[PDB]
Design a protein around this nucleic acid. Structure first.
Ligand SMILES: [Mg+2]
Ligand SMILES: [Mg+2]
Ligand SMILES: [Mg+2]
Ligand SMILES: [Mg+2]
Ligand SMILES: [Mg+2]
Ligand SMILES: [Mg+2]
Ligand SMILES: [Mg+2]
Ligand SMILES: [Mg+2]
Ligand SMILES: [Mg+2]
Ligand SMILES: [Mg+2]
Ligand SMILES: [Mg+2]
Lengths: 151, 261, 113
RNA sequence: UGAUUCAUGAUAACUCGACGGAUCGCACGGCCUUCGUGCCGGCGACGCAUCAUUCAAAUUUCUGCCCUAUCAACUUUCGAUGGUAGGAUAGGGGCCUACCAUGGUGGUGACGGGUGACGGAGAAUUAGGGUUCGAUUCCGGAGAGGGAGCCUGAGAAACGGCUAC
RNA sequence: GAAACUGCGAAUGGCUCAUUAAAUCAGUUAUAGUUUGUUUGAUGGUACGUGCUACUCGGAUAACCGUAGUAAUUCUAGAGCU
């Protein structure tokens, strides 16, 4: 409903407010990262194409890619994957978190949008140090491996 | 528990440290090292307790962080390093050397020595066996593993070990007729000469050892450690020549020192 | 009239100091102050600088008229800073102290960033 | 070695190989080959891999524990006792699986009940012999409201970690 | 030098005695039936080259900048760097 735009081509992002159903009918009922035609969103987005990807809602539960429902499911999430970014959480810890699904639907509050089409001696010293030190282990090897041989 | 134990409460420490039961709740926990942590003496004890070069746990820490202290030929920073039987403790700043050997009362002594005795230690071999590609090597009871020994050094024998070139410079074939110092039990420290060894198939073997002045005693083969070939030692015996004695005798000695004083 | 008696004296190069037990005999006196005792030791060991003298743990035996204590002499002031407890430096004026507030000390910091 | 088809060697292959340094410090200081941080070459910090050691555990042999028979039989279909082959484990083992046999314990007290029962080192009392206590600072074990299942990790069935009820 | 990524630790200690009656436990055994970060000591060639002596250097992620949602908390999304 509230939309947060960004572009990687320049590096600028901006939040806008829209509330018209027919401007979002082709916005509802789709999924993250699958391209959307820009013309439906209005007459001032032509030529611009958005890759719809990400978004949060009332209750603030982010969309997660790969879960196919306008629902709010309880997933067991590893610290390091999207929608779980615990800090100081004892690696190996998991949680069952609540995340909205990736189907763009009525129940979101903010949609995330991006624009696709605009309208040395150390190494030398240290290297040959090892090589001289590998050659000596066989230097040491032969130095005692034959002294015992005569016995 | 669910893992190792990192604390040593004082009452649980080896009795031969002579730590005092009210001097604190814990003791120095001996770190993993070349000696078996019940037959060792850590560095903390040697500095603060015996030598009194320090007054606290933190002061001995600083001394090692200046690196004045060297053990067995190499400089050791560890506070609770497990020094053991026949180690050498040397402080070049003071220019002093020590062997670690037992009282007749079974407690470690820092035996002051010259430089020429610092060059070497003695070790008894744990076992001799083949290894990678059939390359003969031996285990000592000091953790050390020496590859390419004399084919004569068998199990239980003792070796001289130069700390500079680090290989065998001599060896004693453990057998009857040599002088030995005992490193465990109630007889630990007591030196003497193997008079007999009786084995028992499937058990430990018993060594029979007699003080220079007649007294006869026995241990098991584990606590035996030859010093020299024949009667003569290859190391400097401590303040008492390994001869243990009755309680009456040291009572007599004080009053005998108390008749001259 | 007091007499100053140092026993169990041993000089270690490892911490670059000389250590001993001080016995002070002080008839008539309640107790000799460490500042006053500071001076007498500096004038018996020729230390050239009165600040490398550190004494503590005075016991003042039953009956009066005698006290024990412990004394540290360093030969370098630089040494007297590295190998010394930071509070014993304060006792000789070489430093000053601070306090804490236990609340907040880390608990809400751990939550912030 | 008390005792091993042991240690260890040779050979024939097999693996979708964990591995076998693209890392970091000060200190300079011998001498040119193009006189070119120039060829060197030091001491160290961290790291990977095998064996040994150490700090440890995990199982494990023998003997040993209070009161009770108004508790004389208990276990065994569906593991109870053994066998063989596997599976799993870090590894032995009915630990688990398939097939087979009919075993295992018991008046020397099995099985079952009570315990205001964690075990020991110990404590009170003590002519001796004893009687009673031992939650508690040392050692061993077990638990974190009750059960259970796990992740990470060398090590946890962890709770000042997680998941479910 | 702070933050932050990375590595290690947090499996020790502290507390208690509920369950538990050959069980835990004690003395005494065994592992040739096992794992073992760490310490200490030793050890380490071949990757492909048709082993006739080494064969080239990948993006992307914190701290940071900035847009935000949720009443919500070391809840959480998207873009720009390194
Ligand atoms: Mg320790
Ligand atoms: Mg079977
Ligand atoms: Mg089997
Ligand atoms: Mg109970
Ligand atoms: Mg109770
Ligand atoms: Mg409670
Ligand atoms: Mg537990
Ligand atoms: Mg739990
Ligand atoms: Mg708590
Ligand atoms: Mg504990
Ligand atoms: Mg090593």
């Amino acid at each position: 409903m509230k939309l947060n735009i960004a572009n990687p081509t320049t590096g600028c992002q901006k939040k806008v407010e829209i509330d018209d159903d027919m401007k979002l009918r082709n916005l509802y009922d789709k999924r993250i990262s699958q391209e959307v035609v820009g013309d439906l969103l209005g007459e001032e987005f032509e030529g611009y194409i958005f890759k719809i990807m990400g978004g949060c809602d009332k209750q603030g539960f982010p969309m997660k890619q790969g879960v196919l429902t306008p629902g709010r499911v309880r997933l067991l999430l590893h610290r390091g994957t999207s929608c779980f970014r615990g800090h100081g959480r004892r690696v190996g810890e998991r949680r069952r978190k609540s995340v909205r699904g990736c189907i763009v639907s009525q129940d979101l509050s903010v949609i995330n949008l991006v624009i696709v089409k605009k309208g040395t001696p150390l190494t030398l010293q240290r290297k040959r140090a090892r090589i001289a030190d590998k050659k000596k282990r066989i230097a040491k090897k032969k130095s005692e491996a034959a002294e015992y041989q005569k016995l | 528990a669910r893992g190792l134990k990192k604390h040593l409460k004082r009452l649980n420490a080896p009795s031969h440290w002579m730590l005092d039961k009210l001097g604190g709740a814990f003791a120095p926990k001996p770190s993993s090292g070349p000696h078996k942590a019940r037959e060792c003496l850590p560095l903390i004890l040697i500095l603060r307790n015996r030598l009194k070069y320090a007054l606290t746990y933190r002061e001995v820490q600083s001394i090692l962080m200046q690196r004045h202290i060297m053990v067995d030929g190499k400089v050791r920073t560890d506070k609770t390093y497990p020094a053991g039987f026949m180690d050498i403790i040397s402080i070049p700043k003071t220019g002093e050397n020590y062997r670690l050997l037992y009282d007749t009362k079974g407690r470690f002594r820092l035996h002051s020595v010259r430089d020429e005795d610092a060059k070497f230690k003695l070790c008894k071999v744990r076992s001799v066996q083949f290894g990678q590609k059939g390359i003969p090597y031996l285990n000592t009871y000091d953790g050390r593993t020496i590859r390419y020994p004399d084919p004569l050094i068998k199990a239980n024998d003792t070796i001289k070990l130069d700390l500079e070139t680090n290989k065998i410079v001599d060896f004693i074939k453990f057998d009857v007729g040599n002088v030995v110092m005992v490193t465990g039990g109630r007889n630990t420290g007591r030196v003497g000469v193997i008079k007999n060894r009786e084995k028992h198939k499937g058990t430990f073997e018993t060594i029979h050892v007699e003080d220079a002045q007649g007294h006869q005693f026995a241990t098991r083969l584990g606590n035996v450690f030859t010093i020299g070939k024949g009667t003569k030692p290859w190391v400097s015996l401590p303040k008492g020549k390994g001869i243990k004695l009755t309680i009456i005798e040291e009572q007599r000695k004080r009053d005998a020192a108390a008749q001259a004083a | 009239a007091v007499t100053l008696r140092t026993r169990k004296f041993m000089t270690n190069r490892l911490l670059s100091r000389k250590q001993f037990v001080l016995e002070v005999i002080h008839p008539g006196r309640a107790n000799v102050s460490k500042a006053d005792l500071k001076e007498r030791l500096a004038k018996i060991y020729e230390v050239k600088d009165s600040n490398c003298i550190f004494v503590f743990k005075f016991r003042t035996h039953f009956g009066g008229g005698k006290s024990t204590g412990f004394g540290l002499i360093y030969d370098n002031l630089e040494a007297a800073k590295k190998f010394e407890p930071k509070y014993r430096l304060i006792r000789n004026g070489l430093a000053t102290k601070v306090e804490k507030s236990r609340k907040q000390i880390k608990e809400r910091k751990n939550r912030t960033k």
